[PDB]
Swiss-Prot record, chain A:
Changing residue 81 to A: Decreased binding to acetylated histone H3. The gene is MLLT3. It comes from Homo sapiens (Human). This is Protein AF-9. The YEATS domain specifically recognizes and binds acylated histones, with a marked preference for histones that are crotonylated. Also binds histone H3 acetylated at 'Lys-9' (H3K9ac), but with lower affinity. Binds crotonylated lysine through a non-canonical pi-pi-pi stacking mechanism. The YEATS domain also binds DNA. The lineage of its organism: Eukaryota, Metazoa, Chordata, Craniata, Vertebrata. The chain holds residues 1 to 138 of 568 of the full protein. Signal peptide: none annotated.
Curated annotation (Swiss-Prot), chain B:
This is Histone H3.3. The modification N6,N6,N6-trimethyllysine is found at residues 2, 7. The modification N6,N6-dimethyllysine is found at residues 2, 7. The modification Allysine is found at residue 2. The modification N6-lactoyllysine is found at residue 7. Variant histone H3 which replaces conventional H3 in a wide range of nucleosomes in active genes. Constitutes the predominant form of histone H3 in non-dividing cells and is incorporated into chromatin independently of DNA synthesis. Deposited at sites of nucleosomal displacement throughout transcribed genes, suggesting that it represents an epigenetic imprint of transcriptionally active chromatin. Nucleosomes wrap and compact DNA into chromatin, limiting DNA accessibility to the cellular machineries which require DNA as a template. The modification N6-(beta-hydroxybutyryl)lysine is found at residues 2, 7. The modification 5-glutamyl serotonin is found at residue 3. The chain holds residues 4 to 11 of 136 of the full protein. Changing residue 5 to V: In BRYLIB2; uncertain significance; no effect on protein abundance. The modification N6-butyryllysine is found at residue 7. It is linked to Glioma: Gliomas are benign or malignant central nervous system neoplasms derived from glial cells. They comprise astrocytomas and glioblastoma multiforme that are derived from astrocytes, oligodendrogliomas derived from oligodendrocytes and ependymomas derived from ependymocytes. Bryant-Li-Bhoj neurodevelopmental syndrome 1: An autosomal dominant disorder predominantly characterized by global developmental delay, impaired intellectual development, poor or absent speech, and delayed motor milestones. Clinical manifestations are highly variable, including abnormal head shape, dysmorphic facial features, oculomotor abnormalities, feeding problems, and non-specific brain imaging abnormalities. Additional features may include hearing loss, seizures, short stature, and mild skeletal defects. It is found in: Nucleus; Chromosome. The modification N6-methyllysine is found at residues 2, 7.
Length: 138, 8
């Protein structure tokens, strides 16, 4: 082949975190929501198999799996923590997935709610024709 | 800092 391909796809990782009007019985002071998505409502499901959100051990059923959009977790809690995220690809070769450490931080009562956005670029060199077709639908 | 405490 004379030809070669590099494909780039953009992901957005983010979260919202808000102080509750009233704490929960466990003493969870905050509502939050973390997510993985494409920018401008683009459809990353063409190439994403699933998104795994690994919550802090203090949460029940800490491995949260989303096989279909929206890839998000909504929860309540009292403290910020590092939240590993795995994005799995509909790829039959390497790489099968990419891993991020997401910083799920909360702000103190009195400060505006958290609305955080983290942009990530993924680059795939010479994907298979099957995977390439999926990436370029997104 | 604006942040709450953290857990680990």
């Amino acid at each position: 082949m004379a030809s070669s391909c590099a494909v780039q796809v953009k992901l957005e990782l983010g979260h919202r975190a808000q102080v509750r009007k009233k704490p929960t019985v466990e003493g969870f002071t905050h509502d939050w929501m973390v997510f993985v998505r494409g920018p401008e409502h683009s459809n990353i499901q063409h190439f994403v198999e699933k998104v795994v959100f690994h919550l802090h051990e203090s949460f029940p059923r800490p491995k949260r799996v989303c096989k279909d959009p929206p890839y998000k977790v909504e929860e309540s809690g009292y403290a910020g923590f590092i939240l590993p995220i795995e994005v799995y690809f509909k790829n039959k070769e390497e790489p099968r997935k990419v891993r991020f450490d997401y910083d799920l931080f909360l702000h103190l009562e009195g400060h505006p709610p958290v609305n955080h956005l983290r942009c990530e670029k993924l680059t795939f060199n010479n994907p298979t024709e099957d995977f390439r077709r999926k990436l370029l639908k997104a | 800092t604006k942040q709450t405490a953290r857990k680990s």
